[PDB]
Coordinates of C-alpha atoms and ligand atoms in Angstrom, one line a residue:
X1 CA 120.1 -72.0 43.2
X2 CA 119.0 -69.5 46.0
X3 CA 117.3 -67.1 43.6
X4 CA 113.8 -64.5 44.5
X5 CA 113.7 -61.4 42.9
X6 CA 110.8 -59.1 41.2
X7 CA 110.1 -56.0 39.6
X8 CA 106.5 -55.8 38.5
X9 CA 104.5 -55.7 42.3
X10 CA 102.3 -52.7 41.5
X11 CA 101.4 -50.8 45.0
X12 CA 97.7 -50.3 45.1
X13 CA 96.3 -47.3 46.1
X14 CA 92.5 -48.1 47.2
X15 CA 91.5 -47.5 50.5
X16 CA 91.3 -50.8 52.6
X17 CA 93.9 -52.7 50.4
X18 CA 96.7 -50.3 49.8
X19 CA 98.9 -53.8 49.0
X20 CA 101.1 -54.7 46.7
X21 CA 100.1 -56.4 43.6
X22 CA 101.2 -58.0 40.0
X23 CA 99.6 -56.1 37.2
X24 CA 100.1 -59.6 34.2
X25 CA 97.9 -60.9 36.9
X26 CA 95.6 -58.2 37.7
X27 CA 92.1 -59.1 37.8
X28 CA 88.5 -57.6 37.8
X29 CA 88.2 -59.9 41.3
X30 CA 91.6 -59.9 42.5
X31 CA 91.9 -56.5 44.7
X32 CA 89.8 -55.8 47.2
X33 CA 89.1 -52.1 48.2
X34 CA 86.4 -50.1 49.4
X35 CA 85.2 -47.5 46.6
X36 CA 83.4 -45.9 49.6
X37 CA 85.0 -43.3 52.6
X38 CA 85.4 -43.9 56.0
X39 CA 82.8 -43.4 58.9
X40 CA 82.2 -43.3 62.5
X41 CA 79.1 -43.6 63.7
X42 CA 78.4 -44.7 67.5
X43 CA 82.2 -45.1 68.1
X44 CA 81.4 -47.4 64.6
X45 CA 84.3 -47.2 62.5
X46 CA 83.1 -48.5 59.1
X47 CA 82.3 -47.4 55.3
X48 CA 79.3 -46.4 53.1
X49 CA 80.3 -48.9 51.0
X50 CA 79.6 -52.3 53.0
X51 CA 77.8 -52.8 56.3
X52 CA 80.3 -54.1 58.3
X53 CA 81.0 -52.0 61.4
X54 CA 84.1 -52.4 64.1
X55 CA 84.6 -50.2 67.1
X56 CA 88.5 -51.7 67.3
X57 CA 90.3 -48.7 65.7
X58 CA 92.2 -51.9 64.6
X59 CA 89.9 -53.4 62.8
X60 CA 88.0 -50.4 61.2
X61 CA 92.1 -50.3 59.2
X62 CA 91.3 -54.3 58.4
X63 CA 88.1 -54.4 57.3
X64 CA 88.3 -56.5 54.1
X65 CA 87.5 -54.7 51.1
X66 CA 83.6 -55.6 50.2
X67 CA 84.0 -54.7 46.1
X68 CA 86.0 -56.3 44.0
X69 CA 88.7 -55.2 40.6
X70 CA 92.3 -54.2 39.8
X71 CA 94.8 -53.0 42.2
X72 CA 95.2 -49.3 41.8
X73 CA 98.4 -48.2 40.6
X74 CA 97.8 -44.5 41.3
X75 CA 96.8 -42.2 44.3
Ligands
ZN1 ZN1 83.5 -51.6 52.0
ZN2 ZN1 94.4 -53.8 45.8

């Protein structure tokens, strides 16, 4: 019965998601990327998309995506 395999995870190519993803369930509000670029501002890693701001290198690279639509198949 042991039995897991698939073959239709799209990677995504937006910047704060870059995720896997399944395109016959792609949504409008199922990726979340930032359509913005990166900034640093006062040691303020963050984006000109959203106003959230981390100084943890770490978190700049988690920062949740703050728009919403389809996983990004392409570069
Ligand atoms: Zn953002
Ligand atoms: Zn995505």
């Amino acid at each position: 019965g042991s039995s897991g395999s698939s073959g239709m995870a799209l990677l995504c190519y937006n910047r704060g998601c870059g995720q896997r993803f399944d395109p016959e369930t792609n949504s409008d509000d199922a990726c979340t990327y930032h359509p913005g670029v990166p900034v640093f501002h006062d040691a303020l890693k963050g984006w000109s998309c959203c106003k959230r701001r981390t100084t943890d290198f770490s978190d700049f690279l988690s920062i949740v995506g703050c728009t919403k639509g389809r996983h990004n198949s392409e570069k």
